[PDB]
Amino acid sequence: SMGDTRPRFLWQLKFECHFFNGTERVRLLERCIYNQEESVRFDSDVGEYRAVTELGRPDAEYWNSQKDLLEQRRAAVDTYCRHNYGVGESFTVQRRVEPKVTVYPSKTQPLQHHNLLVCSVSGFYPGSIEVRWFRNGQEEKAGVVSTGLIQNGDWTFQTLVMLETVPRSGEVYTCQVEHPSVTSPLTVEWRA
Amino acid sequence: IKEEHVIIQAEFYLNPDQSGEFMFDFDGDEIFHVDMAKKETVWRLEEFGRFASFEAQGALANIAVDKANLEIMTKRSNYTPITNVPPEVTVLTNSPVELREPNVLICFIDKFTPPVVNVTWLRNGKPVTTGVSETVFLPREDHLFRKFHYLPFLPSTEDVYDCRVEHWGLDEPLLKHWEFDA
Amino acid sequence: VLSFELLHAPATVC
């Protein structure tokens, strides 16, 4: 309907399982959020609920009076976090998708003036990657800028890593990508 | 230390809209959500449904608890409503654009609350309604939300696009422009 | 296949 400006009221519940070194160390953080303010949380390093704001104090007190809820939450690092890690490991933790790497100049400008060379690294997973530029085999760092890591929302990432150059005839520029999906670096050259 | 991972079960209930959500996230990507109308698990990548299962009925019972808890909290706060936080919007493509080679326009809407937004793609000023898909509201550590909308398309240097976003926090529709240059 | 499990939400205090 048009003209709907009624006040809104929001409640969020978040259960976060944090994993360190496979599942050797696991921490559960259960968070309640009213509007934009977290009001109460269960942290498995504490083992009981704690008020984050005064609004949450009644719930921390009430939930901490419940033996069953507390015992269930104290065991949840195993029954929930480690369980779900095991369910999803093979297609999440172990997911590997190789990027497609392309190089192109940013605009058509004459040699011996400034240009930006673009190394596009598309479609990879997980997000840890190293993208570096070389000129005639020597690394270039001062003139490098990037989009940063872009999450596409579809379990792939992309990034552009750009090099400001003054290209001279005969020079070879290389973009080199290292990523857990490949056993040797990917390299793409552009010849001035 | 990208040797850490995080799985989040994130849920919400919003009044007076009567809108719920239930999703799991792994390292910032959605594993699945429960469609609240069809009452079913929707895997973010279809093949995940060949590798794992989930029981949506239990998730839907949690949403009944979340609605009751929202009603309690709304009263307990003396009916304090949410402060709107408007989105920021970025348009990008799945991959570098080449003339007439199929691609996807991505409208990424970020840093907003409450989780209600109207998103329309415009081509040459006119709404493009079908072919689009969209994600549910994805959680952020600051308890705002983000969201992706996707439009498969054929790049042309003559077309222009806008992702038009309406939200209570905005004074006027936000129009994020995109076009392919020669 | 294996099943992801959820944590159930407790009722806040009236």
XYZ file of C-alpha atoms in Angstrom:
388
model
C 0.000 0.000 0.000
C 1.073 3.591 -0.659
C 1.989 5.912 2.140
C 3.031 3.154 4.572
C 5.241 4.876 7.119
C 4.085 2.921 10.145
C 6.840 2.424 12.760
C 8.726 -0.835 12.408
C 9.969 -3.216 15.083
C 12.676 -5.829 14.368
C 13.977 -8.881 16.241
C 17.012 -10.850 15.070
C 18.481 -14.063 16.469
C 22.015 -15.030 15.359
C 23.875 -18.212 16.313
C 27.516 -17.938 15.316
C 29.851 -20.930 15.275
C 33.500 -19.804 15.106
C 36.049 -22.461 14.102
C 39.802 -22.271 14.734
C 42.139 -24.841 13.160
C 39.542 -27.142 11.708
C 37.329 -27.892 14.697
C 40.060 -28.028 17.316
C 38.781 -24.805 18.910
C 35.118 -23.834 18.615
C 33.210 -20.873 20.059
C 29.428 -20.345 19.923
C 28.003 -16.798 20.200
C 24.166 -16.608 20.402
C 23.011 -12.991 19.936
C 19.560 -11.376 20.289
C 19.120 -8.001 18.552
C 16.171 -5.653 19.016
C 16.034 -3.083 16.193
C 19.755 -2.402 15.782
C 20.901 -3.121 19.349
C 22.167 -6.460 20.645
C 20.405 -6.946 23.973
C 21.574 -10.351 25.321
C 24.151 -12.970 24.314
C 25.284 -16.485 25.190
C 29.038 -16.930 24.692
C 30.329 -20.488 25.111
C 33.523 -19.093 26.650
C 31.240 -17.833 29.490
C 28.623 -20.566 29.579
C 25.622 -18.459 30.594
C 23.675 -15.556 29.130
C 24.729 -11.953 29.774
C 22.770 -8.756 29.237
C 24.324 -6.482 26.635
C 21.833 -3.678 27.274
C 19.312 -3.128 30.049
C 16.567 -4.301 27.667
C 18.138 -7.759 27.721
C 18.524 -8.092 31.512
C 15.162 -9.858 32.071
C 15.988 -12.465 29.433
C 19.486 -13.136 30.714
C 18.038 -13.685 34.211
C 15.191 -15.889 32.971
C 17.296 -18.000 30.649
C 20.008 -18.383 33.253
C 17.370 -19.926 35.568
C 16.792 -22.745 33.017
C 19.037 -25.743 33.569
C 17.917 -27.423 30.392
C 18.549 -24.467 28.108
C 21.969 -23.841 29.673
C 23.080 -27.481 29.388
C 21.905 -27.635 25.800
C 23.783 -24.449 24.923
C 26.932 -25.623 26.747
C 26.984 -28.803 24.640
C 26.143 -27.014 21.403
C 29.793 -26.518 20.394
C 29.702 -30.279 19.779
C 26.042 -31.048 18.951
C 25.520 -28.017 16.676
C 28.761 -26.279 15.658
C 31.006 -29.317 15.129
C 28.082 -31.274 13.720
C 27.280 -28.658 11.075
C 30.972 -28.174 10.247
C 31.146 -31.856 9.462
C 27.962 -31.737 7.357
C 29.148 -28.881 5.200
C 32.946 -29.327 5.136
C 33.282 -30.997 1.732
C 31.439 -28.220 -0.191
C 32.279 -25.125 1.882
C 35.589 -25.406 3.715
C 36.936 -27.573 0.874
C 35.308 -25.657 -2.025
C 37.873 -24.589 -4.633
C 37.040 -22.714 -7.865
C 39.771 -21.546 -10.191
C 39.668 -17.927 -11.409
C 39.719 -16.819 -15.009
C 42.480 -14.244 -15.478
C 42.479 -11.646 -18.240
C 44.617 -8.546 -18.907
C 43.604 -5.462 -20.877
C 44.491 -1.767 -21.010
C 41.981 0.593 -19.426
C 41.823 2.974 -22.384
C 43.451 3.427 -25.798
C 46.363 5.840 -25.263
C 49.636 6.214 -27.195
C 52.798 4.557 -25.941
C 55.147 6.643 -23.734
C 52.334 8.376 -21.722
C 50.267 7.089 -18.781
C 47.921 4.100 -18.975
C 46.291 1.769 -16.486
C 46.643 -1.940 -17.200
C 43.877 -4.102 -15.722
C 44.309 -7.655 -14.426
C 40.830 -9.096 -13.993
C 40.665 -12.178 -11.770
C 37.127 -13.554 -12.021
C 35.120 -16.330 -10.484
C 37.312 -17.805 -7.737
C 36.725 -19.412 -4.349
C 37.847 -19.124 -1.534
C 38.669 -15.467 -1.202
C 42.365 -15.726 -0.237
C 44.375 -14.804 -3.343
C 47.591 -13.062 -4.343
C 47.609 -10.964 -7.521
C 50.870 -9.296 -8.474
C 52.236 -7.299 -11.416
C 55.666 -7.623 -13.105
C 57.414 -5.517 -15.699
C 60.035 -7.468 -17.629
C 60.058 -9.911 -14.705
C 60.594 -7.314 -11.932
C 57.716 -6.737 -9.515
C 55.821 -3.436 -9.657
C 54.200 -2.288 -6.380
C 54.087 1.521 -6.089
C 51.608 2.007 -8.911
C 49.172 -0.833 -8.067
C 45.572 -0.266 -7.033
C 42.651 -2.665 -6.752
C 38.898 -2.908 -6.354
C 39.682 -5.077 -3.326
C 38.020 -8.456 -2.929
C 34.480 -8.421 -4.360
C 32.001 -11.075 -3.125
C 29.516 -11.759 -5.932
C 26.901 -13.323 -3.668
C 27.039 -16.653 -5.519
C 30.032 -18.325 -3.808
C 32.521 -16.687 -6.159
C 34.743 -13.660 -5.814
C 36.348 -11.329 -8.288
C 38.870 -8.530 -8.199
C 40.567 -6.071 -10.564
C 44.230 -5.341 -9.833
C 45.465 -2.379 -11.891
C 48.922 -1.054 -12.688
C 49.638 2.511 -13.720
C 52.286 2.168 -16.493
C 54.156 4.268 -19.002
C 54.458 1.437 -21.517
C 57.349 1.391 -23.956
C 57.541 -0.732 -27.081
C 59.084 -4.116 -26.287
C 58.112 -4.248 -22.622
C 56.293 -7.332 -21.301
C 53.927 -6.938 -18.348
C 52.783 -10.050 -16.460
C 49.926 -10.496 -13.992
C 50.566 -13.498 -11.739
C 47.844 -15.100 -9.624
C 48.400 -17.516 -6.729
C 45.309 -19.205 -5.303
C 44.519 -22.482 -3.448
C 42.655 -23.844 -6.510
C 45.872 -24.150 -8.581
C 49.178 -25.888 -7.901
C 51.253 -23.464 -10.031
C 50.694 -19.721 -10.482
C 48.459 -18.495 -13.297
C 50.154 -15.928 -15.488
C 48.877 -13.645 -18.231
C 51.158 -11.337 -20.263
C 50.524 -8.070 -22.097
C 53.144 -6.874 -24.569
C 53.555 -3.150 -25.186
C 44.617 -16.903 9.379
C 41.900 -17.484 6.834
C 42.066 -20.912 8.769
C 39.084 -19.605 10.669
C 35.551 -20.108 9.408
C 32.190 -18.971 10.768
C 28.746 -20.488 10.244
C 25.808 -18.242 11.231
C 22.185 -19.231 11.641
C 20.470 -15.850 11.216
C 16.772 -15.252 11.712
C 14.479 -12.286 11.964
C 10.905 -11.254 12.429
C 9.660 -7.786 11.443
C 6.390 -6.099 12.365
C 3.945 -4.773 11.257
C 5.032 -6.382 7.965
C 4.804 -9.868 9.494
C 7.985 -10.831 7.601
C 10.285 -13.588 8.803
C 13.568 -14.905 7.515
C 15.743 -17.937 8.379
C 19.113 -18.532 6.703
C 22.543 -20.052 7.212
C 25.709 -18.223 6.165
C 29.252 -19.612 5.777
C 32.081 -17.052 5.634
C 29.711 -14.409 4.307
C 27.950 -16.573 1.662
C 24.440 -17.960 2.090
C 24.221 -21.748 2.309
C 20.417 -21.775 2.229
C 17.311 -20.011 3.398
C 13.758 -21.118 4.167
C 11.210 -19.624 1.780
C 8.473 -18.336 4.074
C 5.723 -18.523 1.485
C 6.485 -21.910 -0.104
C 7.727 -23.289 3.267
C 10.730 -24.977 1.804
C 14.516 -24.985 1.927
C 16.112 -23.017 -0.956
C 19.799 -23.929 -1.434
C 21.889 -21.003 -2.639
C 23.735 -23.229 -5.123
C 21.437 -25.983 -6.342
C 24.004 -28.747 -5.945
C 24.156 -28.171 -2.156
C 20.825 -30.053 -1.980
C 22.581 -33.161 -3.304
C 25.227 -32.932 -0.569
C 23.246 -32.089 2.576
C 19.720 -31.785 3.915
C 17.799 -29.488 6.229
C 14.438 -29.816 7.935
C 12.503 -26.621 7.254
C 9.625 -27.405 9.675
C 11.863 -26.791 12.710
C 13.067 -23.494 11.248
C 9.459 -22.409 10.769
C 8.729 -23.203 14.420
C 11.629 -20.982 15.397
C 10.004 -18.184 13.388
C 6.833 -18.603 15.485
C 9.001 -18.133 18.642
C 10.739 -15.136 17.074
C 7.404 -13.443 16.303
C 6.188 -13.968 19.882
C 9.530 -12.667 21.240
C 9.358 -9.605 18.997
C 5.910 -8.797 20.384
C 7.249 -9.123 23.952
C 10.309 -6.976 23.196
C 8.273 -4.308 21.417
C 6.144 -3.842 24.540
C 9.137 -4.127 26.887
C 10.882 -1.301 25.017
C 7.708 0.863 25.370
C 7.169 0.533 21.609
C 10.514 1.949 20.589
C 10.669 1.650 16.781
C 13.710 1.015 14.649
C 15.704 3.952 13.295
C 15.912 3.674 9.516
C 19.428 3.368 8.088
C 19.405 3.929 4.281
C 21.301 1.655 1.892
C 24.369 2.291 -0.130
C 24.253 0.804 -3.603
C 26.926 -0.456 -5.997
C 26.331 -1.837 -9.524
C 28.933 -4.116 -11.091
C 29.075 -7.029 -13.522
C 29.907 -10.712 -13.094
C 32.911 -10.309 -15.392
C 34.578 -7.763 -17.703
C 32.050 -6.584 -20.268
C 32.380 -7.447 -23.977
C 29.952 -6.274 -26.661
C 27.054 -8.754 -27.071
C 28.669 -11.417 -24.828
C 26.205 -12.549 -22.150
C 26.944 -11.177 -18.645
C 25.135 -10.353 -15.402
C 24.521 -6.956 -13.863
C 24.737 -7.097 -10.063
C 23.053 -4.532 -7.830
C 24.540 -4.787 -4.372
C 22.549 -2.998 -1.665
C 24.357 -2.657 1.670
C 24.299 -1.197 5.193
C 20.547 -0.774 5.653
C 17.752 -1.520 8.072
C 14.913 -2.481 8.469
C 15.051 -5.272 5.861
C 12.428 -3.990 3.424
C 13.574 -2.519 0.119
C 12.134 -1.994 -3.309
C 14.644 -2.629 -6.081
C 13.889 -2.103 -9.784
C 16.213 -2.389 -12.722
C 15.765 0.280 -15.381
C 17.027 -0.037 -18.956
C 16.957 3.258 -20.857
C 14.688 4.608 -18.141
C 12.122 1.799 -18.257
C 11.573 -1.016 -15.732
C 12.941 -4.424 -16.691
C 10.786 -6.809 -14.676
C 11.461 -10.439 -15.725
C 14.737 -12.371 -15.810
C 15.798 -10.759 -12.546
C 16.597 -12.763 -9.438
C 17.475 -11.667 -5.925
C 18.843 -12.892 -2.627
C 17.198 -12.745 0.754
C 18.516 -10.203 3.294
C 22.030 -11.197 4.301
C 23.271 -10.365 7.814
C 26.066 -7.976 8.776
C 28.090 -7.816 11.987
C 26.622 -4.365 12.717
C 23.136 -5.947 12.456
C 22.277 -4.066 9.272
C 21.642 -6.048 6.087
C 22.894 -6.466 2.541
C 21.290 -7.928 -0.558
C 22.101 -8.796 -4.176
C 19.888 -8.462 -7.261
C 20.959 -9.954 -10.579
C 20.071 -9.206 -14.221
C 21.448 -11.378 -17.080
C 21.978 -9.151 -20.120
C 23.647 -8.633 -23.492
C 26.079 -5.646 -23.295
C 25.466 -2.804 -25.723
C 27.068 0.617 -25.836
C 23.739 2.247 -26.522
C 21.804 0.981 -23.521
C 22.070 2.546 -20.099
C 21.026 0.899 -16.848
C 20.020 2.084 -13.407
C 19.434 0.151 -10.254
C 16.650 2.081 -8.543
C 16.406 1.497 -4.787
C 13.639 2.725 -2.475
C 13.910 2.509 1.302
C 12.348 4.327 4.265
C 15.747 5.815 5.180
C 16.084 7.579 1.788
C 14.539 10.979 0.968
C 14.134 9.957 -2.679
C 14.830 6.842 -4.781
C 18.523 6.117 -5.161
C 19.441 5.579 -8.854
C 22.814 3.905 -9.393
C 23.783 4.200 -13.011
C 25.765 1.760 -15.133
C 26.720 1.736 -18.788
C 29.195 0.041 -21.119
C 31.676 2.392 -22.756
C 33.242 1.734 -26.165
C 23.201 -37.286 3.130
C 23.831 -35.591 6.492
C 21.568 -32.845 7.837
C 22.390 -29.379 9.057
C 20.847 -28.856 12.488
C 19.453 -25.690 13.984
C 19.415 -24.279 17.476
C 15.915 -23.656 18.740
C 14.954 -20.212 20.005
C 13.874 -19.901 23.667
C 10.900 -17.775 24.659
C 11.861 -14.405 26.203
C 10.409 -13.494 29.549
C 6.934 -11.955 29.775
